[PDB]
Swiss-Prot record, chain A:
Residues of the full protein shown: 143 to 598 of 598
Family: Belongs to the DNA polymerase alpha subunit B family.
Disulfide bridges in this chain: none
Source species of the chain: Homo sapiens
Biased composition (Low complexity): 1-16
Phosphoserine carried by residues: 5, 10, 12
Record keywords, A-Z: DNA replication, Nucleus, Phosphoprotein
Descriptive protein name: DNA polymerase alpha subunit B
Statement: the UniProt record of this protein carries the keyword Hydrolase: no
Function: Accessory subunit of the DNA polymerase alpha complex (also known as the alpha DNA polymerase-primase complex) which plays an essential role in the initiation of DNA synthesis. During the S phase of the cell cycle, the DNA polymerase alpha complex (composed of a catalytic subunit POLA1, an accessory subunit POLA2 and two primase subunits, the catalytic subunit PRIM1 and the regulatory subunit PRIM2) is recruited to DNA at the replicative forks via direct interactions with MCM10 and WDHD1.
Keyword Cell inner membrane found: no
Subunit-structure text: Component of the alpha DNA polymerase complex (also known as the alpha DNA polymerase-primase complex) consisting of four subunits: the catalytic subunit POLA1, the regulatory subunit POLA2, and primase complex subunits PRIM1 and PRIM2 respectively. Within the complex, POLA1 directly interacts with PRIM2/p58.
GO molecular function: DNA binding
Curated annotation (Swiss-Prot), chain B:
Zinc finger (CysA-type): 18-53
Miscellaneous section: In eukaryotes there are five DNA polymerases: alpha, beta, gamma, delta, and epsilon which are responsible for different reactions of DNA synthesis.
Protein residues bound to Zn(2+) 2: 83, 88, 106, 109
Illness: Pigmentary disorder, reticulate, with systemic manifestations, X-linked: An X-linked recessive disorder characterized by recurrent infections and sterile inflammation in various organs. Diffuse skin hyperpigmentation with a distinctive reticulate pattern is universally evident by early childhood. This is later followed in many patients by hypohidrosis, corneal inflammation and scarring, enterocolitis that resembles inflammatory bowel disease, and recurrent urethral strictures. Melanin and amyloid deposition is present in the dermis. Van Esch-O'Driscoll syndrome: An X-linked recessive syndrome characterized by different degrees of intellectual disability, moderate to severe short stature, microcephaly, hypogonadism, and variable congenital malformations.
Effect on the protein upon substituting residue 116 to L: In VEODS; no effect on protein abundance; decreased DNA replication
Name of the protein in question: DNA polymerase alpha catalytic subunit
This protein's domain notes: The CysA-type zinc finger is required for PCNA-binding.
Species annotation: Homo sapiens
Region (DNA-binding): 1-111
Curated annotation (Swiss-Prot), chain C:
Superkingdom of origin: Eukaryota
Function, in words: Regulatory subunit of the DNA primase complex and component of the DNA polymerase alpha complex (also known as the alpha DNA polymerase-primase complex) which play an essential role in the initiation of DNA synthesis. During the S phase of the cell cycle, the DNA polymerase alpha complex (composed of a catalytic subunit POLA1, an accessory subunit POLA2 and two primase subunits, the catalytic subunit PRIM1 and the regulatory subunit PRIM2) is recruited to DNA at the replicative forks via direct interactions with MCM10 and WDHD1.
Domain notes: The RNA:DNA duplex-binding domain interacts with the template phosphates at positions -2, -1, 1, and 2 positioning its bases -1, 1, and 2 for duplex formation. Interacts only with the beta- and gamma-phosphates of triphosphate moiety of initiating NTP of the primer.
Disulfide cysteine pairs (residue numbers): none
Chain ranges passing through the membrane: none
Effect on the protein of changing residue 93 to A: Decreases primase affinity for POLA1 by 40-fold
The protein's name in its UniProt record: DNA primase large subunit
Coiled coil: none
Family: Belongs to the eukaryotic-type primase large subunit family.
Swiss-Prot record, chain D:
Organism: Homo sapiens
Domain of life, per lineage: Eukaryota
Keywords: Chromosome, DNA-binding, Nucleus, Telomere
GO biological process terms, semicolon-separated: negative regulation of telomere maintenance via telomerase; telomere capping
Function comment: Component of the CST complex proposed to act as a specialized replication factor promoting DNA replication under conditions of replication stress or natural replication barriers such as the telomere duplex. The CST complex binds single-stranded DNA with high affinity in a sequence-independent manner, while isolated subunits bind DNA with low affinity by themselves. Initially the CST complex has been proposed to protect telomeres from DNA degradation. However, the CST complex has been shown to be involved in several aspects of telomere replication.
Subunit-structure text: Component of the CST complex, composed of TEN1/C17orf106, CTC1/C17orf68 and STN1; in the complex interacts directly with STN1.
Protein's name in the database: CST complex subunit TEN1
InterPro entries found in the cross-reference section: NA-bd_OB-fold, Ten1_animal_plant
Molecular function, one GO term: telomeric DNA binding
Cellular localisation: Nucleus; Chromosome, Telomere
Location (main, coarse): nucleus
The family this protein is said to belong to: Belongs to the TEN1 family.
Regions recorded as binding DNA: 1-121
Length: 456, 197, 241, 121
């Protein structure tokens, strides 16, 4: 019952026999929490589920005028971000005043600025320049020396508060580096704790191999969802990858929008039997969508009345609330970019992934890196409006090309199920368990209890 | 006062390989040739040996057009800045925060001002060009003699050809209906008057 | 009902600036249409004598051709009034450089408003006066009979004891300049007594002239910020077309 | 010939240390431009406190106002009944990216040399 018809799109669909030759199906590579002795079963959407969108006071719902940018707007956005973060840090840390960058002095001073690189290459411990805020330093630049710093962790576009001695006003010798202050957690309400138990499935694209348009992994995932009967299903893009070999050469014989609509119809009609909730998160690799971050939601006007209550489309990125548990959804490969563009020094062994996740959490932004990667487009007004973290999410989801992992950083669970397909072989997806903890505990208990990364 | 040829002088011409013979077909106008050779650019392939009608490849042409438009949009949004100083020519993506009376100050020489490498005007002109070469109605209306227009409509421009041209034109008009370069905000224009809001 | 609330009357004083977003092509077309209408109004005024029938008929035809708002209909007049409003504001932006251009623009606008007012029904005149900020004062009947002979002698378009069934208005002498100039109104201790028709016509024209002059002077300080690369060829071409 | 424009720091002008009618030249960051009354408000940040300078610009219009840019104002100070003190600008030029600490150091050096030269009489 493959509603999607690869033969109807292109006459050159040859399935990858390697994927069909797999034999390690159902293997749980890794787990976390109370995942031992617990069977994974849900109500199949027959219970009570609440979905909401939070974040900016105006959630992204429609498109916007895009192909028009001016430098003063970008400068204003950057200055406002730097000033707000610096003011919050100063108020939290009880600092007296910020010395201007170009003012020389013989005594230790506290400065505020943005970490940047003076060259077009990667950052290193010898080419770091601090760029201060407009109000306090008129956007001046001054090289920074980290030879006297015991520990540090920097990437371009990071807002830091540094203390040191600036004798000449043209070079600063580092002596300290304040740590980021995470946002406060969400406060549950009476209705949030009313939900007893539910579990959520998460998967990310692409849904095909590198040599076929059969979408066999999509059918396997649909069958898995039907068998398991989960509560809420969240599927990431891209649904029609623009890096596919067939799509790049324009060998498809059908319009992109029609193919995407057929795929959506296939998914919805396959998952109707389970009765769960579906959420679709757009990605920048879709070939029939605007390549600008943030991204307006998907459009599909052929929905049935019943399917409206079970099929939902959200923006990219989106902060989704499920039964009072805040989720952080983003399809961008933040971890890969940050790892490629990060430098640090440690006196002992440390986890790079934990450091990157902590930097993401403490920057109060979904894309703290600046300048962005060479293959990304950002609309800075829309980015400043619709891409801000409201609060620290209880559960954070971020697919990436790196190795799958489940980690707890600063009380926020980070899950990276990874791609569903890796070249011509199957990948992995994840399943989450959500139980509201008792309110009699001394400290806030993590609602997420069990997470399993299941091979597909 | 500028003509169509002068207005779109710097626009990159659309090129699509013929699926049958593989040879590319450079498109620059609705009609190719002058004089007695009034023929749609999609009617015949460049290769005389090739007999495949390019009009049969409407879906492939639309897909290639979408890919090209996406590539141009991504190219514009990269934001490359080049120093105006002839002796500096600094090329960077990092926008300096130390502005001046005119624009950003180049950190390499500290005497000149950076300029965008690919301005929004060029991108809008490119999109308008990609709409222009697939508008058969305007091309027919531009014909001086009505008898020649009627003859061309009868011999070649069947309603299906007009529908295909409309589809191709809509493929670019969809992107063109989101640009902020063709939408004036009167609220900011008349923000200086507050006697009556 | 935003449509009728925004544009309830054909006559306007052009106080509220527009606040919506429009495309560039419509902007240019509106500017060109209003400049053509102004030139046609000037030519019609110069060629004929103000009033008559042929002049007003040709003006009505010109207004109808350029899809503007001149008459009063209960259905589908949002578009002409909106076009008139936006085009007038664009022309005001384009015509605030020199004294001569300001004088010409004010003259043409005053003539157009005078015609549109002359083609209006009486209750519509009262409603339009109420809608705008002007408030007038009517003297009592005792005062009216106390100064009947002087008003009749001045004869502000009144002949043969026609003071009856009329309302006499009291206004400062600095606002009745048109009538005050050529001994067509009775002046007493700093006030002018005017019959209804003359007071509405002349005082509305004068107040509109003063308000338009003040607002154009205010808008003169704006184009120092009009460094936009767009709208610049249009403004330059329209300045000395 | 107008009186010379001596330098004055914003926190000296805002503290009422300048007599009426004195000609002064100060600096600050633009914040507002009320076109109806042609009034411009400037602040300069000293430490953790903000001081304001009001400038009437009736003699320099038309004007291109940029919010958030440094300005240098030359004019005569006038005391008003309710609006405090307002500077009637004669020349108002836009400077962006000036090294402010260098300017203050130069001002103090000039004042010190003037005091030293005046100490012999």
């Amino acid at each position: 019952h493959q509603l999607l018809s690869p033969s109807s799109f292109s006459p050159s669909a040859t399935p990858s026999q390697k994927y069909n030759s797999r034999s390690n199906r159902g293997e749980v590579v890794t787990s976390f929490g109370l995942a031992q002795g617990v069977s994974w079963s849900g109500r199949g959407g027959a219970g009570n589920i609440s979905l909401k969108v939070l974040g900016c006071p105006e959630a992204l719902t429609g498109s916007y005028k895009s192909m028009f940018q001016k430098l003063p707007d970008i400068r204003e956005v950057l200055t406002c971000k730097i000033e707000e973060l610096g003011s919050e840090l100063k108020e939290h840390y009880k600092i007296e005043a910020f010395t201007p960058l170009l003012a020389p002095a013989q005594e230790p001073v506290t400065l505020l600025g943005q970490i940047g690189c003076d060259s077009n290459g990667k950052l290193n411990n010898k080419s770091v320049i601090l760029e201060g805020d407009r109000e306090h330093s008129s956007g001046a630049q001054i090289p920074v020396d980290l030879s006297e710093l015991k520990e540090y962790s920097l990437f371009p576009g990071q807002v830091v508060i540094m203390e040191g001695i600036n004798t000449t006003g043209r070079k600063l010798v580092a002596t300290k580096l304040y740590e980021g202050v995470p946002l406060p957690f969400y406060q549950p309400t009476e209705e949030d704790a009313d939900f007893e138990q539910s579990m959520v499935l998460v998967a990310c694209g692409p849904y095909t191999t590198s040599d076929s348009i059969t979408y066999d992994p999509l059918l396997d995932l649909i069958a898995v969802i039907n068998h398991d009967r989960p509560d809420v299903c969240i599927l990431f893009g891209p649904f029609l990858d623009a890096k596919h070999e067939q799509v790049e050469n324009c060998l498809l014989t059908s319009p992109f929008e029609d193919i995407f609509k057929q795929c959506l119809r296939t998914i919805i009609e396959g998952t109707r039997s389970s009765g769960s909730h579906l959420v679709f998160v757009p990605s920048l690799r879709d070939v029939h969508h605007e390549p600008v971050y943030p991204q307006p939601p998907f459009s599909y006007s052929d929905l049935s009345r019943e399917d409206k209550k079970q099929v939902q489309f959200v923006s990219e990125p989106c902060s989704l609330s499920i039964n009072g548990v805040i989720f952080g959804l983003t399809s961008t490969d933040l971890l890969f970019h940050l790892g490629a563009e990060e430098i640090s020094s440690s006196s002992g062994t440390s986890d790079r992934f934990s450091r990157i996740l902590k930097h993401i959490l403490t920057q109060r932004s979904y894309y703290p890196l600046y300048p962005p990667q060479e293959d990304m487009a950002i609309d800075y007004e829309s980015f400043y409006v619709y891409a801000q973290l409201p609060v620290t999410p209880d559960v954070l989801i971020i697919p990436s090309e790196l190795r799958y992992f489940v980690k707890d950083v600063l009380g926020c669970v980070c899950v990276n199920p990874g791609r569903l397909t890796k070249g011509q072989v199957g990948g992995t997806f994840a399943r989450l368990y959500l139980r509201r903890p008792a309110a009699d505990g001394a400290e806030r208990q993590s609602p997420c209890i069990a997470v399993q990364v299941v091979r597909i | 006062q500028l003509t169509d040829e002068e207005k779109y002088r710097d626009c990159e011409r659309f090129k699509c390989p013929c699926p049958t013979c593989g040879t590319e077909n450079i498109y620059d106008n609705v009609f190719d040739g002058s004089g007695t050779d009034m023929e749609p650019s999609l009617y015949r392939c460049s290769n005389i040996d090739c007999k495949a009608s390019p009009l049969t490849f409407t879906v492939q042409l639309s897909n290639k057009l979408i890919m090209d438009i996406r590539r141009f949009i991504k190219k514009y949004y990269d934001g490359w800045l080049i120093c105006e100083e002839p002796t500096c020519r600094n090329r960077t993506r990092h926008l300096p925060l130390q502005f001046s009376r005119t624009g950003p100050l180049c950190p390499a020489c500290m005497k000149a001002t950076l300029q965008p490498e690919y301005s929004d005007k060029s991108l809008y002109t490119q999109l308008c060009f990609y709409r222009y070469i697939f508008d058969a109605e305007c091309a027919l209306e531009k014909l001086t003699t009505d008898h020649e227009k009627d003859k061309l409509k009868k011999q070649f421009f069947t309603p299906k050809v007009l529908q295909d041209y409309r589809k191709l034109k809509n493929t670019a008009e969809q992107f063109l209906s989101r640009s902020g370069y063709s939408e004036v905000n009167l609220s900011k224009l008349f923000a200086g008057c507050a006697v009556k809001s | 009902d935003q449509r009728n609330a925004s544009y309830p009357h054909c006559l306007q004083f052009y106080l509220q600036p527009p606040s919506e977003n429009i495309s560039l092509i419509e902007f240019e077309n509106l500017a060109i249409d209003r400049v053509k209408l102004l030139k046609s109004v000037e030519n019609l005024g110069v060629s004929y004598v103000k009033g008559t029938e042929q002049y007003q008929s040709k003006l009505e035809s010109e207004l109808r051709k350029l899809k503007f708002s001149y008459r009063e209909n209960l259905e589908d007049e949002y578009e002409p009034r909106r076009r008139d409003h936006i085009s007038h504001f664009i022309l005001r932006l384009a015509y605030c450089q020199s004294e001569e251009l300001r004088r010409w623009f004010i003259q043409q606008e005053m003539d157009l408003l005078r015609f549109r007012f002359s083609i209006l029904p009486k209750d519509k005149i009262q409603d339009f006066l109420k809608d705008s900020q002007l408030q007038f004062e009517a003297i009592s009947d005792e005062e009216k009979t106390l100064r009947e002979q002087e008003i009749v002698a001045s004869s502000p378009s009144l002949s043969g004891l026609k003071l009856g069934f009329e309302s006499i208005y009291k206004i400062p002498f600095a606002d009745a300049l048109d009538l005050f100039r050529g001994r067509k109104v009775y002046l007493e201790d700093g006030f002018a007594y005017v019959p209804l028709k003359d007071i509405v016509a002349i005082i509305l024209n004068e107040f509109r002239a003063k308000l338009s002059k003040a607002l154009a002077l205010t808008a003169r300080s704006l184009p120092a910020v009009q460094s936009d690369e767009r709208l610049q060829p249009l403004l330059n071409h329209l300045s000395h077309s | 010939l107008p009186k010379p424009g001596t330098y004055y720091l914003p926190w000296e002008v805002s503290a009422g240390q300048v007599p009426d009618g004195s000609t002064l030249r100060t600096f600050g960051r633009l914040c507002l431009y009320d076109m109806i009354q042609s009034r411009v408000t400037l602040m300069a940040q000293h430490g953790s406190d903000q001081h304001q300078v009001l400038v009437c610009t009736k003699l320099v219009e038309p004007f291109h106002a940029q919010v958030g840019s440094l300005y240098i104002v030359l004019g005569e100070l006038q005391h008003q009944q309710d609006r405090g003190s307002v500077v009637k600008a004669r020349v108002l030029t836009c400077v962006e990216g000036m090294n402010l600490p260098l300017l203050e150091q130069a001002i103090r050096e000039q004042r010190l040399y003037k005091q030293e030269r005046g100490g012999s009489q």
